[PDB]
């Protein structure tokens, strides 16, 4: 086996040891492996996969293969690969093209190495994506391959936003499952994953005390809620910015002061609109929005000296790092940790005090500066991915007549019953014991003893 | 000249008025609606039957409805939840209200009937505001001619919405309803944070027990169970959680709670042998939050640690098998809404007996029965939605639609997300919060208007 | 016929007894002493002048002292802290007690005098139990002859100890004293966790304000300040802390609080220009915890955000300049111990004015004034220490010693650490907690006895 | 041509220097001392033997000592705690340092001897800075003539102070010592909040285990156990606490933890039958914090839930019986300082065995072994005390005193509270905190100087 490219194949034994541990941390995913192994529901599936090549993704990949699939894999971020995970996957005879610290050019080449096998397009028939970069490449550059592809399973909020836009414009060519919006994904991974991994990443990058310092978290969706808790539970004084008044209300009730970087919340593009007194007190800013330029150049100029700047949203353009590359000198402290010296572009005093610390060059910091979400959280997300792969592969969209295809071309979530069955394996993994409704109680609230227990409108 | 009311003590009106004036300053969303709509009188002609806890917070709601043009006739929806100074201030303002703390069940029914009837005949009501659905069911079973001229029902709480949806499914719901509970500024504000504030409040007022270091079991982890669990954990309780819904149980685990069942392997086989006696024998406090029936049952009550406190914060008291305790055990009133229940027998007890449980509010929802319910600034969200829902259904004029047009609007719906957001904005400004305004480029990048709504209807917050 | 008492309403006795029976089950350290020493009667012959908040918890203390053989004559140490059902139950037990909630200052002084005098003549007291030093100073200044027959003072609280140490330093202390405050099972239990339980309790009872998301300023971060800040932070307040002690301020920072001063650069030059008006204009709640004077002064009160709540949980009301507010602003009573202070001037208020502050308990310690003080399970520690300190000083019989012997024993001392640990053990067993027993090898390895004491006297916990 | 050092890799120096420059901005009390005393050179002529974790933070300490005039010879006090880039940067600045991460025990001892000897003979040392007492012991046992010229020891940690006080009580301590550990800005900053920061940090780096919703048992609840319990509880762990000291156990209860013992009724009867197997079979993580011996013993390790993590954050690895595991069970290295310990036998294992434990840092203190120890801004307090303590003892010149003068000064003492407050003030200012200044009237009222000290020496904070 040579159909791979990783940083260091000799890291495979280490990766395998950590994969074995992760298996014990992922009962929902391992439960799927044991339940479906005999049936081989993914036999004949050929899955193009593009998502962070971590230990957790390793268990996902080996589950898909255990259920019958062939895959070709790449990471979806230049800094998120764990080289020991990539090595163990390569060592198991699975094509993987990923390493921590890719250039942008190498990132694209890796995705292309999955799309092409031995110089020609692979006969792929399934896609697993995180954020939609592979989805867009297939649509823009390889539309003929989409004729043979039965579906896409998309991991994350930004990827879903891009899928819905294509569907709205009539450009989506195969159906998709929104894996993000399973409750055992969005309200587990997006929130509690970041609760675990944001302070983890900041500590590994800087080793800064967080207790007693001032943080500003931009956004209070699922990622912003978990990120704010990551910081507050360490004793940070956290302020929260939001454009959505409902999410701002939740931030208030959770005990956070809600503030804007701009006077009266109005960004008129001028420096005069920056709340300089507020930003001058902030030791740490974290962007969580999935939006663009929410930590802009004027905010970066006004931040307190030596503030830490990081992003845990999907794409690095939440922060105007381009402005910083154009105007300020970058000092590498260590990989994925840069001091950005606001004193000039072409040099800096080694003992300068007017700098910012940028983590992961603005790429998602939990994966770039630590290891991302822990296995027992990714268990929920990735159990959903496997169910979504099984569901779309069994439907065989690519083999339907044109009229049948029109009826199935959608972006759907998994049924609530499967959401509950994933959650139950997660609960048992903690040693939790769910109560069984009596027949009288089940009649009283109008559900089956087996579930589902909530209407589809329920928000948890 | 006004006598069309019944309250505990009208002399409490001045105190109630003082507390209403304070609550106005804590309810910016509700008082914003009062300012915004007073000139146009959107509820002119509305005659609202209202049945919800006669608190200070409900008083501000009532006076907002009246300020916008409505007439009302009011009762409380629970026998223990009225604040007598609130009822007195409302009656003193010339508003028909029939409510006092400590009603009997017969007086509860009479009070609702006093709103329905005026001078012994059906009132010309045309709107209904309800909490839990008791008023709604009485109208459907006993006063169907009155429903002909009623334009809608606005329903406050999870249990009432369940009852409305069941009537709609069976085709017996006679007028459209707005599910006020499922505004995010209700369900994810009131149901959760209100119980966070008021559960430990009620337990302290009823018992003055230290909670730190003691063991609690919360039955349920929906919105009320989540807020209830935090109310106790933030005081230092060691909180375990029970759930039938594995997704909610997953949230409890991630939130740092041990998830347990009262029954071995979660299976209630009906016998004492299925009870986890070791677990229940360690619990100092059990709180029911489910909206379900008999989730703190006789066999659990028998197994609880001596001197444990038992209470319910769900809508109805049958969450706990209090009937079993009335039939079998000796009740000793400590003070109003606090009883020691002696497990040594039915007829009499030794005053120094150590084998008792403490029941709060006779199993009725404890935050309203033993304290004052949710605080004004939280009820601001729920009741701003109520006012918006009353305006919405009243303007639609369902009773005046022809039969074929009624058929297209007979539903149970929530308010538009834009209104939910506008309520939350006023709440946020009440805290001094400053929301950020999207730039045009950012609004285009995420595909929303700068004015909102900011999330798709599928968003769960 | 027993008549040697004055309480608000003797008919509350039965309610008080019911709550005393409950509190006994919540105070295992105190009731452990009652059971261990009953046969020995170590306080036979003791005649105790007691002056401390006449609560249910103090009731259990009083009845413990009596059960161990003492006679007592009791008053409350604060005009607002008595629980009338507790005072009635004690009076109904034939115990002289002079206390009711809502005393005037003259009535407060008169009550202390009714304990000192029996049938118009000085009682033959030989022991003192005090909270804050008022009774101690009256005896020293007004009844010095009574001190010749007194064997010692046991003092509950930080402020009272400060006053005792000053008298010892100046040679005016006439009898030995035990500093009960500085047992760890007092200072690091009662002062901290008691306020944690009872500060947000009192604020909710007085105002029913939502605390979540609002801004608080706690003045001081000693034991009371630490517990008060946690009481508010755990409810979701955004808490800032002020301190003059940099070590305490360091703890506040590490605990996750912003440390700020009401004054620019922390310097109070007496002028309004030194007030940080922007800071105070955002504060919704200020709580004074210092035992110091005028830490919430007139210029701070002028600068506070409209409708801020103002309260004190330190020992005396002069932490807040309420004299300035009485002289310059108009007071509107909302209900007992809750006043709106209208900053619009003297000489009349508009009932709908928005420019007021809310003052709780007229500046007196708010946990006892607007709620019920610390819960029984916390006061268990403080009051087991009191019982042990009374036994200790009474057995020493200072008043009977020759002058050279008295000279050597005239001091202000804390109880031995071994007793402190023995109180804590009973508290821990009350929670079901299980301490581990050191093996002899482990005890040898750290240089302690298996029995304890486990820490050197320098240890700070 | 500087060669008087031994480190892992000198080419890591530039990276170490970058992190030192950052750490200087995180250590304002230490850099304040540098600026205050540089001109005075108070440590001119000082020659310090240093033995403490060769971290970035120790690097800032070393460079402060040198900047005040000292020469040093340095080693790490633990085989796994050195940060190799820190050591390289110190060596690159021309400072003798003998330290690398992953020393053998033999190399550990050789490194200490390289500080003691220079070119084969005793260095002309005259000061000692130590953590845990290994260097102090070696000097007393093997180099008594060197102690003749040494003016003092400054000891960092609880375990080292315990060893100093035993030598003092036995007459074998040869030079005076400063207990740096018991400054409040050390013990109640470093010991507590340092572990709060770095314990969950080390566990995440070693295992990347989710902690939320899992079960932990923290052995001990002193300063380290308090900070460790919070480290885990704040992550959502369900934390149980063990203690032999009932006062610390009481604090754990009040802080909201269940207090349990690994042994039934807390009593070890010398057999497996006294292990609470039901309790330990539920524990996912056990952390020892005691400074005691064998508090996680062989029978406890046999009973732990499969796949539980085992670690120690006390000073020495013998808190856990790792010797039993080396003798009986098969060790599989996951990665450096992370081992799976297969309870299925000593001779080999199945790679997919489920019956293993995970041991971090081979039982050596886990925050330093699997992460980077405490953060700079916390070590600021500890190491500012170290500098002040070195200055104080060096200026006293004990070695030069006549025998009868030595006798009056041979002691183990803490720094004065005034210095403790001055360190804290610089820490507070580092956070942007603003302490209030007492007015003259307020200072008189509480009996302190406006400058401080603000508390009596008995105060426990
Ligand atoms: N790093 C991780 O492991 C991880 C985990 C989950 C999701 N994600 C990514 O994180 C991002 C956020 O995901 P989510 O699920 O929380 O989305 P979300 O829609 O739930 O929340 C994003 C929030 O940002 C707010 N926002 C938008 N523009 C803003 C602005 N200018 N100022 C302030 N707030 C603003 C929105 O109002 C919204 O509430 C997405 O890109 C998603 O793909 C990352
Ligand atoms: N007292 C208050 O102020 C207040 C506030 C809001 C709602 N309510 C009432 O509280 C109740 C709960 O409301 P909600 O909005 O949280 O509803 P919800 O549907 O969100 O949550 C109820 C939860 O109970 C769980 N449950 C049901 N049967 C169970 C059983 N046998 N054991 C364990 N868990 C079980 C369900 O899985 C569900 O998650 C309703 O009756 C509602 O009307 C009261
Ligand atoms: N209400 C209760 O139940 C209760 C309980 C215990 C004690 N007390 C009383 O509370 C008070 C405080 O007791 P404690 O044990 O916490 O005392 P403490 O000495 O531990 O703490 C008081 C703190 O106030 C700080 N302080 C003093 N002046 C200040 C100022 N101008 N600005 C800011 N901070 C200032 C001091 O630095 C000190 O840290 C005393 O009067 C005590 O008798 C009341
Ligand atoms: N790793 C770090 O960074 C770090 C930081 C500070 C101190 N330390 C070390 O940590 C250890 C603890 O220090 P500390 O300051 O917390 O000491 P401490 O005296 O404050 O606390 C130790 C506690 O352990 C308890 N204990 C003793 N034997 C026990 C047993 N068998 N079971 C349960 N509890 C038991 C004692 O009662 C005591 O409360 C010392 O070895 C110290 O040198 C390490
Ligand atoms: N980063 C660090 N650098 C140096 N010493 C440390 C660090 N973290 C913890 N310590 C110290 O290690 C000692 C235990 O050996 C504790 O007393 C503590 O002060
Ligand atoms: Cl032994
Ligand atoms: K991970
Ligand atoms: K209320
Ligand atoms: K009480
Ligand atoms: K560090």
Short mmCIF file of C-alpha atoms in Angstrom, two decimals, chain A residues 129-383:
data_model
loop_
_atom_site.label_atom_id
_atom_site.label_comp_id
_atom_site.label_asym_id
_atom_site.label_seq_id
_atom_site.Cartn_x
_atom_site.Cartn_y
_atom_site.Cartn_z
CA UNK A 129 -18.11 16.80 3.90
CA UNK A 130 -17.40 19.42 6.56
CA UNK A 131 -17.97 23.00 5.41
CA UNK A 132 -18.62 22.28 1.74
CA UNK A 133 -15.21 22.81 0.11
CA UNK A 134 -15.30 19.33 -1.45
CA UNK A 135 -18.98 19.71 -2.31
CA UNK A 136 -18.29 22.93 -4.22
CA UNK A 137 -15.25 21.47 -6.02
CA UNK A 138 -17.30 18.52 -7.22
CA UNK A 139 -20.05 20.85 -8.46
CA UNK A 140 -17.75 23.42 -10.09
CA UNK A 141 -14.97 21.21 -11.45
CA UNK A 142 -16.26 17.59 -11.56
CA UNK A 143 -20.02 17.70 -12.31
CA UNK A 144 -19.89 14.41 -14.23
CA UNK A 145 -18.90 12.60 -11.03
CA UNK A 146 -22.06 13.89 -9.34
CA UNK A 147 -24.11 11.89 -11.84
CA UNK A 148 -22.94 8.73 -10.02
CA UNK A 149 -23.14 10.12 -6.47
CA UNK A 150 -26.13 9.19 -4.28
CA UNK A 151 -25.80 11.91 -1.67
CA UNK A 152 -23.79 14.21 0.57
CA UNK A 153 -23.69 14.11 4.37
CA UNK A 154 -22.62 17.51 5.70
CA UNK A 155 -21.16 17.95 9.19
CA UNK A 156 -21.30 21.61 10.07
CA UNK A 157 -23.38 24.79 10.15
CA UNK A 158 -21.39 26.60 7.46
CA UNK A 159 -21.62 23.61 5.14
CA UNK A 160 -25.38 23.42 5.61
CA UNK A 161 -25.73 27.14 4.86
CA UNK A 162 -23.93 26.56 1.55
CA UNK A 163 -26.06 23.48 0.74
CA UNK A 164 -29.32 25.35 1.32
CA UNK A 165 -28.10 28.20 -0.89
CA UNK A 166 -27.36 25.79 -3.75
CA UNK A 167 -30.75 24.13 -3.29
CA UNK A 168 -32.41 27.57 -3.30
CA UNK A 169 -30.63 28.38 -6.59
CA UNK A 170 -31.28 25.02 -8.22
CA UNK A 171 -27.56 24.20 -8.41
CA UNK A 172 -27.42 21.31 -5.91
CA UNK A 173 -27.09 18.15 -8.02
CA UNK A 174 -27.53 15.41 -5.36
CA UNK A 175 -29.57 15.20 -2.15
CA UNK A 176 -27.93 15.90 1.18
CA UNK A 177 -28.44 15.16 4.86
CA UNK A 178 -27.91 18.03 7.30
CA UNK A 179 -26.00 16.11 9.97
CA UNK A 180 -25.33 19.34 11.88
CA UNK A 181 -28.95 19.73 12.98
CA UNK A 182 -29.38 16.44 14.76
CA UNK A 183 -29.75 17.39 18.41
CA UNK A 184 -26.97 14.88 19.17
CA UNK A 185 -24.81 16.96 16.83
CA UNK A 186 -25.64 20.69 17.12
CA UNK A 187 -26.58 20.67 20.80
CA UNK A 188 -23.74 18.29 21.72
CA UNK A 189 -20.74 18.86 19.41
CA UNK A 190 -21.24 22.53 18.55
CA UNK A 191 -21.81 23.58 22.17
CA UNK A 192 -20.15 21.13 24.55
CA UNK A 193 -17.36 20.29 22.13
CA UNK A 194 -16.24 23.92 22.22
CA UNK A 195 -16.77 24.08 25.97
CA UNK A 196 -14.12 21.36 26.26
CA UNK A 197 -11.74 22.38 23.51
CA UNK A 198 -11.61 26.19 23.45
CA UNK A 199 -9.91 26.76 26.81
CA UNK A 200 -7.87 23.63 26.01
CA UNK A 201 -6.54 25.21 22.82
CA UNK A 202 -5.84 28.59 24.44
CA UNK A 203 -3.92 26.91 27.28
CA UNK A 204 -1.81 24.81 24.91
CA UNK A 205 -0.97 27.80 22.73
CA UNK A 206 -0.18 30.42 25.38
CA UNK A 207 -0.39 28.77 28.81
CA UNK A 208 -2.15 31.99 29.93
CA UNK A 209 -4.04 32.14 33.17
CA UNK A 210 -7.64 32.82 32.21
CA UNK A 211 -9.18 33.41 35.65
CA UNK A 212 -9.75 37.09 36.37
CA UNK A 213 -9.09 38.31 32.81
CA UNK A 214 -11.59 39.90 30.39
CA UNK A 215 -12.93 38.02 27.35
CA UNK A 216 -15.17 39.13 24.47
CA UNK A 217 -16.98 36.30 22.66
CA UNK A 218 -18.45 37.35 19.31
CA UNK A 219 -21.60 35.32 18.72
CA UNK A 220 -23.85 33.28 20.99
CA UNK A 221 -25.15 30.51 18.79
CA UNK A 222 -24.28 26.95 19.73
CA UNK A 223 -20.52 27.51 19.34
CA UNK A 224 -20.66 30.88 21.10
CA UNK A 225 -22.66 29.41 24.00
CA UNK A 226 -20.13 26.61 24.50
CA UNK A 227 -17.18 28.96 23.99
CA UNK A 228 -18.50 31.46 26.55
CA UNK A 229 -18.94 28.64 29.06
CA UNK A 230 -15.41 27.36 28.33
CA UNK A 231 -14.06 30.75 29.40
CA UNK A 232 -16.49 31.59 32.21
CA UNK A 233 -15.98 28.24 33.97
CA UNK A 234 -12.26 29.15 34.11
CA UNK A 235 -13.14 32.42 35.88
CA UNK A 236 -12.95 34.77 32.94
CA UNK A 237 -15.14 37.86 33.00
CA UNK A 238 -16.89 37.20 29.67
CA UNK A 239 -18.78 39.76 27.59
CA UNK A 240 -20.83 38.60 24.59
CA UNK A 241 -21.66 40.29 21.26
CA UNK A 242 -24.63 39.24 19.14
CA UNK A 243 -26.70 40.49 16.23
CA UNK A 244 -29.58 38.15 17.13
CA UNK A 245 -31.62 39.57 20.04
CA UNK A 246 -32.91 36.12 21.05
CA UNK A 247 -29.38 34.77 21.43
CA UNK A 248 -28.43 38.00 23.23
CA UNK A 249 -31.32 37.43 25.64
CA UNK A 250 -29.99 33.95 26.42
CA UNK A 251 -26.54 35.47 27.04
CA UNK A 252 -28.04 37.96 29.51
CA UNK A 253 -29.95 35.24 31.38
CA UNK A 254 -26.81 33.06 31.44
CA UNK A 255 -25.09 35.87 33.33
CA UNK A 256 -23.07 37.66 30.65
CA UNK A 257 -22.98 41.37 29.88
CA UNK A 258 -23.98 41.90 26.23
CA UNK A 259 -21.87 44.52 24.43
CA UNK A 260 -21.00 45.64 20.91
CA UNK A 261 -17.52 46.48 19.59
CA UNK A 262 -19.22 49.48 17.94
CA UNK A 263 -20.87 52.45 19.61
CA UNK A 264 -24.62 51.74 19.79
CA UNK A 265 -23.91 48.59 17.81
CA UNK A 266 -23.49 50.58 14.57
CA UNK A 267 -20.39 49.88 12.49
CA UNK A 268 -20.14 52.86 10.17
CA UNK A 269 -16.74 51.68 8.91
CA UNK A 270 -14.87 54.51 10.65
CA UNK A 271 -12.56 54.23 13.63
CA UNK A 272 -14.80 56.75 15.41
CA UNK A 273 -17.47 54.04 15.74
CA UNK A 274 -15.19 51.62 17.63
CA UNK A 275 -15.83 51.45 21.37
CA UNK A 276 -12.16 51.99 22.18
CA UNK A 277 -12.70 52.03 25.95
CA UNK A 278 -14.33 48.60 25.78
CA UNK A 279 -11.82 46.97 23.43
CA UNK A 280 -8.91 48.48 25.39
CA UNK A 281 -9.88 46.24 28.35
CA UNK A 282 -10.24 42.95 26.46
CA UNK A 283 -7.54 40.32 27.06
CA UNK A 284 -9.09 37.71 24.75
CA UNK A 285 -11.45 37.85 21.76
CA UNK A 286 -13.01 34.71 20.27
CA UNK A 287 -15.09 34.70 17.08
CA UNK A 288 -17.86 32.08 16.81
CA UNK A 289 -20.22 33.42 14.14
CA UNK A 290 -19.70 31.74 10.79
CA UNK A 291 -19.92 35.32 9.45
CA UNK A 292 -17.28 37.51 7.80
CA UNK A 293 -15.08 40.19 9.35
CA UNK A 294 -16.66 40.20 12.81
CA UNK A 295 -13.26 41.04 14.34
CA UNK A 296 -12.26 43.75 11.89
CA UNK A 297 -9.14 45.87 11.38
CA UNK A 298 -10.35 48.78 13.53
CA UNK A 299 -11.17 46.39 16.39
CA UNK A 300 -7.70 44.86 16.10
CA UNK A 301 -6.12 48.32 16.30
CA UNK A 302 -8.09 49.13 19.48
CA UNK A 303 -7.56 45.86 21.37
CA UNK A 304 -5.61 45.94 24.62
CA UNK A 305 -1.90 45.30 24.19
CA UNK A 306 -1.07 41.56 24.33
CA UNK A 307 -4.68 40.47 23.89
CA UNK A 308 -5.15 36.97 22.48
CA UNK A 309 -7.17 36.75 19.23
CA UNK A 310 -8.68 33.52 17.97
CA UNK A 311 -11.46 32.06 15.87
CA UNK A 312 -13.46 28.89 16.45
CA UNK A 313 -15.95 29.45 13.61
CA UNK A 314 -15.48 27.44 10.48
CA UNK A 315 -13.42 29.88 8.33
CA UNK A 316 -10.55 32.22 9.21
CA UNK A 317 -12.11 35.26 7.53
CA UNK A 318 -14.11 35.99 10.75
CA UNK A 319 -10.94 37.92 11.67
CA UNK A 320 -9.26 40.34 9.27
CA UNK A 321 -5.92 38.55 9.30
CA UNK A 322 -5.22 39.92 5.82
CA UNK A 323 -5.04 43.42 7.29
CA UNK A 324 -2.57 42.09 9.86
CA UNK A 325 -0.43 40.41 7.20
CA UNK A 326 -0.37 43.63 5.22
CA UNK A 327 0.53 46.01 8.04
CA UNK A 328 2.06 44.20 11.03
CA UNK A 329 5.10 42.02 11.68
CA UNK A 330 4.43 38.37 12.54
CA UNK A 331 6.67 36.58 15.05
CA UNK A 332 6.28 32.83 15.31
CA UNK A 333 6.39 31.83 18.95
CA UNK A 334 5.85 28.18 18.03
CA UNK A 335 3.64 26.45 15.43
CA UNK A 336 0.15 27.97 15.32
CA UNK A 337 1.15 30.77 17.74
CA UNK A 338 2.15 34.19 16.38
CA UNK A 339 2.85 37.51 18.03
CA UNK A 340 1.57 40.26 15.72
CA UNK A 341 3.58 43.41 16.37
CA UNK A 342 1.49 46.53 15.83
CA UNK A 343 4.59 48.73 15.63
CA UNK A 344 5.39 48.13 11.97
CA UNK A 345 5.66 45.62 9.17
CA UNK A 346 9.37 45.13 8.43
CA UNK A 347 10.76 44.59 11.90
CA UNK A 348 9.98 44.48 15.56
CA UNK A 349 11.85 44.93 18.81
CA UNK A 350 12.25 41.47 20.35
CA UNK A 351 11.09 43.05 23.63
CA UNK A 352 8.21 45.06 22.12
CA UNK A 353 5.13 45.17 24.34
CA UNK A 354 2.56 46.31 21.73
CA UNK A 355 1.62 43.03 20.09
CA UNK A 356 -1.34 40.70 19.80
CA UNK A 357 -1.26 36.92 20.01
CA UNK A 358 -3.05 35.19 17.13
CA UNK A 359 -3.77 31.47 17.44
CA UNK A 360 -3.80 29.08 14.44
CA UNK A 361 -3.39 32.00 12.03
CA UNK A 362 -7.11 32.54 12.59
CA UNK A 363 -8.14 29.01 11.60
CA UNK A 364 -10.45 27.15 13.94
CA UNK A 365 -8.46 27.21 17.13
CA UNK A 366 -9.67 24.08 18.96
CA UNK A 367 -8.43 21.88 16.11
CA UNK A 368 -5.42 24.06 15.23
CA UNK A 369 -3.94 24.50 18.71
CA UNK A 370 -5.25 21.38 20.43
CA UNK A 371 -7.06 18.22 19.32
CA UNK A 372 -10.59 19.48 18.65
CA UNK A 373 -13.58 17.94 20.36
CA UNK A 374 -13.04 14.86 22.55
CA UNK A 375 -13.95 11.40 21.33
CA UNK A 376 -17.00 10.98 23.54
CA UNK A 377 -18.57 14.12 22.06
CA UNK A 378 -17.64 13.33 18.43
CA UNK A 379 -19.29 9.95 19.04
CA UNK A 380 -22.66 11.66 18.62
CA UNK A 381 -21.76 13.62 15.49
CA UNK A 382 -20.14 10.67 13.78
CA UNK A 383 -22.82 8.13 14.69
#
